[PDB]
Amino acid sequence: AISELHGPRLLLRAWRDSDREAFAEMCADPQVMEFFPSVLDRAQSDALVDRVQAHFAERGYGPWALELPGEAAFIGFTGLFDVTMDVHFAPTVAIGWRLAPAYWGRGLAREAAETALDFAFERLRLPEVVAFTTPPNRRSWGLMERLGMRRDPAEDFDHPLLAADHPMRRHILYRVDAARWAER
Ligand SMILES: CC(C)(COP(=O)(O)OP(=O)(O)OC[C@H]1O[C@@H](n2cnc3c(N)ncnc32)[C@H](O)[C@@H]1OP(=O)(O)O)[C@@H](O)C(=O)NCCC(=O)NCCS
């Protein structure tokens, strides 16, 4: 009983067991995982899918599996997740995305994110959605600003689930509120 969302090309849907093989391939891909501490093995990939499924069970939304009707069953994920960790901007709702590299450069993450944020603001009627990444991940924060999300560099933060001296600790924060989304 999970709400599926449609864009012109994409179906944002609940995860299926058949997704785990294709998602594990992505999580083992160094180009997909470049701006994360490590690639994941199958056990770690499956544990991430388990957390996504638990988010859907608890909240009725989550990082949707991305299907491309007419083309491919599974190309990655894009969607909303609740931020509960000890950061200055919590509690709030965030948006995240991970696409198989064959699908980059097609505006498919843009379309998935527009579909997810329409749901956030029209259906859930949330006041704001945030997103966060590392400065080197230019494809990721580039998508954030193209969506109309905006960054205050003063809100840069150290990720509280990484070591205080972790080389990838430094994150940047983007925000979009309901009014800014509507004004696009
Ligand atoms: C982050 C990520 C989802 C971005 O995907 P993306 O395909 O670059 O993003 P978009 O969907 O906005 O597509 C933009 C590109 O498509 C092009 N494009 C083509 N048709 C388009 C259309 N109809 N609409 C928009 N852009 C279009 C743009 O020109 C741009 O190309 P460019 O990068 O050469 O300038 C992807 O790179 C990824 O999965 N990265 C690895 C995982 C990751 O780091 N996730 C984020 C962690 S914080």
Author numbering: 9 to 192
Sentences copied from the publication:
Enzymes in the Gcn5-related N-acetyltransferase (GNAT) superfamily are widespread and critically involved in multiple cellular processes ranging from antibiotic resistance to histone modification. Previously, we determined the structure of the PA3944 GNAT enzyme from Pseudomonas aeruginosa and found that it could acetylate polymyxin antibiotics, specifically the 3-Dab residue on polymyxin B and on colistin. The canonical chemical mechanism attributed to GNATs is a general acid/base mechanism; however, mounting evidence has cast doubt on the applicability of this mechanism to all GNATs. Instead, PA3944 has a serine (S148) in a comparable location as the typical critical tyrosine residue found in GNATs.
The only residue that could potentially act in this capacity was E102, so we mutated it to alanine and screened the enzyme for activity toward both polymyxin B and NANMO. Specifically, the catalytic efficiency decreased by one order of magnitude compared to WT when polymyxin B was the substrate, but increased by one order of magnitude compared to WT when NANMO was the substrate. Based on these results, it appears that E102 more likely plays a role in substrate specificity rather than in the catalytic mechanism. Since we observed a significant improvement in catalytic efficiency of the PA3944 E102A enzyme toward NANMO, we crystallized the protein to determine whether we would observe structural changes that might help explain the kinetic observations. The removal of the negative charge from the E102 side chain provided space for the orientation of the phenyl ring of F89 to flip inward compared to the WT structure 2. Additionally, the removal of the negative charge of E102 increased the overall hydrophobicity of the acceptor substrate binding site. The change in hydrophobicity combined with the conformational change of the F89 residue helps explain the improvement in apparent affinity of the E102A protein for NANMO compared to polymyxin B. When we examined the same docking studies but in the PA3944 E102A structure, we found the protonated NANMO in presence of AcCoA formed an H-bond with the backbone oxygen of F140 but the free base NANMO formed an H-bond with the backbone oxygen of F43.
